């Protein structure tokens, strides 16, 4: 009989994983403070990694990689890409970004302006987006910097993709969410099902003030958009429809045009930080579910937007993905008494 604890009551993902574990009749849930556990569904912030793997006779496993926040923070990701030789400052799949500290607090203010002035002088598109871990889109550096000083937390200014791929009909923006599971052996599994979070509003390049056609967040569309759910239920197009669209419209497939780049980006990001977070020779074991967010431009080039360390899932895909977590992440360490739903991204460890 395996034992697990639940220390994040707000995780819809691991609320289902916990529901499945108990259904097997072979897992027993303990009080959240009981140290005699096999599996910890830990809290998002300040998870006590230092107390894991010190119980005699208990193989212990946790659903978070210590140090993965370097990848899952706006400013952290930018610093990692620019400082890691594996990714390099010339990384071709990440928008030009800069870490800007508000003046009321290194900082990349001058470096950003140097690149900004170059675009302004070269007649090139000079639209940037400011965001932090509350978004502003503007073509004037004065507005961007002033908007950050009014705040009191670190922000990132990256180049705004002015040529996004637009779905038809609708002429509308979108982003692609990919769920990736890294197990204790640091195998990189890509869930075969992705979701496009589409904007139900026509993309308008002459007005960044109304951010409803520029921000594809599921919460902004369902709150400030007047066409929510028009083209697809819940502004969520899945891969079968999107692949069928790419064939009819662009005479290409989702695998060739987009997925190859997505898998490449995932491997590059996760292989980069493997020496820092691998638990291969550690006294405890880690696995974690990531949510990668990508943007596609009109040239069918994929851009990494951010990486989410505690992602939610599309309602339709909770059952399949959560079961897949129990199969390759939990039961692989604690076996029970297909056609896998994941795509193994082979790599060198």
């Amino acid at each position: 009989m395996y034992t697990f604890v639940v220390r994040d009551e707000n995780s819809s993902v691991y609320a289902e994983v916990s529901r499945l574990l108990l259904a097997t009749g072979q897992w027993k849930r303990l009080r959240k403070d009981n140290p005699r556990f096999n599996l910890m569904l830990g809290e998002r912030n300040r998870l006590p990694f230092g107390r894991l793997g010190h119980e005699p006779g208990l193989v212990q496993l946790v659903n978070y990689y210590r140090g993965a926040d370097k990848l899952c923070r706006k400013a952290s990701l930018v610093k990692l890409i620019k400082t890691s030789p594996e990714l390099s400052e010339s990384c071709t799949w990440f928008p030009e970004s800069y870490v800007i500290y508000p003046t009321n607090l290194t900082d990349e203010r001058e470096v950003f302006l140097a690149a900004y002035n170059r675009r302004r002088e070269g007649r090139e598109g000079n639209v940037w987006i400011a965001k932090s871990s509350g978004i502003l889109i503007s073509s004037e550096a004065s507005e961007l910097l002033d908007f950050i000083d009014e705040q009191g937390q670190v922000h990132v200014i990256q180049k705004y993709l002015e040529k996004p791929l637009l779905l038809e009909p609708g002429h509308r923006k979108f982003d692609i969410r990919s769920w990736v599971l890294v197990d204790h052996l640091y195998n990189i599994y890509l869930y075969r099902e992705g979701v496009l979070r589409t904007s139900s509003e026509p993309y308008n390049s002459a007005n960044f003030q109304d951010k409803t056609c520029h921000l594809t967040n599921h919460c902004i569309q369902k709150e400030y958009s007047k066409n929510y759910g028009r083209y697809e239920e819940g502004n969520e197009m899945f891969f079968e429809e999107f692949n069928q669209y790419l064939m009819d419209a662009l005479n290409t497939t989702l695998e060739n045009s987009i997925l190859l780049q997505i898998k490449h980006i995932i491997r590059s990001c996760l292989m980069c930080i493997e020496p820092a977070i691998s638990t291969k020779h550690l006294h405890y074991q880690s696995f974690q579910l990531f949510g990668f967010d990508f943007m596609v431009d009109e040239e069918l080039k994929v851009w990494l937007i951010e990486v989410n360390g505690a992602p939610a899932c599309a309602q339709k895909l909770y059952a399949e993905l959560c079961q897949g977590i129990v199969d390759v992440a939990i039961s692989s360490v604690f076996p029970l008494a297909p056609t896998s739903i994941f795509i193994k991204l082979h790599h060198h460890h």
Partner: protein, 425 residues
């Protein structure tokens, strides 16, 4: 040289004590005359813990036999190992205590107590470094209960910084001599709450059910019951009587088993308990499962009705200490709902290479569980059913006691029950 002084009082106390000295004398190779005839140096390594060494390489138990009537100790002096005890260590009267706590504690017992303390003082003065005392007695009678607790009180006054432990037999309607046993037991329990460091609760109800159901003994006798007590007392004292990586005296063991001063009443247990399939080898998993099984417990309390504050498990015989840890860690990590989570690593395991006589291996269980409250509730309720009618009180008021002393012992034990309940939640 960490000497222990043994005191046995009353009928039950002397009959269980006699068997205890019979069992451990066999394990240490001491014959009925006190001469050594073993084949292992482990037998004599810690012999001075329970035995004094006299002329001619004779070993004499450091035991004091106390009773208010001669019959039981006449039987001891004529029993198997009767000649091994020091003749001067028999202290007895003629009046008897009539199963009356007041007679043992206030009248008959008071006339004899000073002569008992003289012998106790004599045994203590000859100890290089006395650990403490152990008393065997019942709580349902008069001498072991009344005079036994009186002796504890005067031993604590004279040796206030020495450990005081008891093996205490609790009365049960299923194995009873008189109806006043709940009275005598309730009066004693308060004395133990105050003046003992560890008390092993041996419940005659549990001893009976084990003999009738597990051992398949049609009509259990006091002898059959005392076989279980002997085996249990040998298991709890094994680690002090033999060498090993465990270097523990009575105080160290108390410091790691008693988190609160009044909650020092333990549930003992033993395995195996086989009926006459008696030659079959008993695996470590079987030893562990049974040792934690309620049917192997001797307090007649369900461990699943409370929580373990602390647990000590002693394994005896040649066995895989790796497989021991695996099975122990298995029982904890498979039932961690019955272990308080605010005492980390509260399940300790100890091993001893010398097994009991006639057994390849065995295990002794020592639990400090809040379930023990069910034992004190049972006694408390039997006390109140009679005391609410003042039934049989004249036996006690005739010895100078007042009804107020009963009311206070009633409240003291209900306080004890209430204390266990708060730590169980």
């Amino acid at each position: 040289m960490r000497e222990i002084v043994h005191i046995q009082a009353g009928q039950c106390g002397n009959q269980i004590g006699a068997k205890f000295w019979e069992v451990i004398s066999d394990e240490h190779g001491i014959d009925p005359t006190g001469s050594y005839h073993g084949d292992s140096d482990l037998q004599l390594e810690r012999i001075n813990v329970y035995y004094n060494e006299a002329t001619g390489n004779k070993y004499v138990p450091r035991a004091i036999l106390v009773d208010l009537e001669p019959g039981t100790m006449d039987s001891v002096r004529s029993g198997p190992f009767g000649q091994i005890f020091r003749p001067d260590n028999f202290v007895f009267g003629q009046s008897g205590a009539g199963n009356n706590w007041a007679k043992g504690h206030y009248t008959e017992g008071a006339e004899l107590v000073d002569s008992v303390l003289d012998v106790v003082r004599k045994e203590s003065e000859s100890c290089d470094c006395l650990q403490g005392f152990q008393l065997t007695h019942s709580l349902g009678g008069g001498t072991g209960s009344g005079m036994g607790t009186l002796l504890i009180s005067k031993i604590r006054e004279e040796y206030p910084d020495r450990i005081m432990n008891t093996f205490s037999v609790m009365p049960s309607p299923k194995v009873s001599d008189t109806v006043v046993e709940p009275y005598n037991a309730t009066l004693s329990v308060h004395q133990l709450v105050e003046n003992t460091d560890e008390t092993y609760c041996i419940d005659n109800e549990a001893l009976y059910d084990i003999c009738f159901r597990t051992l398949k003994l049609t009509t259990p006798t006091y002898g059959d019951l005392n076989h279980l007590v002997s085996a249990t007392m040998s298991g709890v004292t094994t680690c002090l009587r033999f060498p090993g990586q465990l270097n523990a005296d009575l105080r160290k063991l108390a410091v790691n088993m008693v988190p609160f001063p009044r909650l020092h009443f333990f549930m003992p247990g033993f395995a195996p308990l086989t009926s006459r399939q008696q030659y079959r080898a008993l695996t470590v998993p079987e030893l562990t499962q049974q040792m934690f099984d309620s049917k192997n417990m001797m307090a007649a309390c369900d461990p699943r009705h409370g929580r373990y504050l602390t647990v000590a498990a002693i394994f005896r015989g040649r066995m895989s200490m790796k497989e021991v840890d695996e099975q122990m860690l298995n029982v904890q990590n498979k039932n961690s709902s019955y272990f308080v989570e605010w005492i980390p690593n509260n399940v300790k395991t100890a091993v001893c290479d010398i097994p009991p006589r006639g057994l390849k291996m065995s295990a002794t269980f020592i639990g400090n569980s809040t379930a023990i409250q069910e034992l004190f509730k049972r006694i408390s309720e039997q006390f109140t059913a009679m005391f609410r009618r003042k039934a049989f009180l004249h036996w006690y008021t005739g010895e100078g006691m007042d009804e107020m002393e009963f009311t206070e012992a009633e409240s003291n034990m209900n306080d004890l029950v209430s204390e266990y309940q708060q730590y169980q939640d």
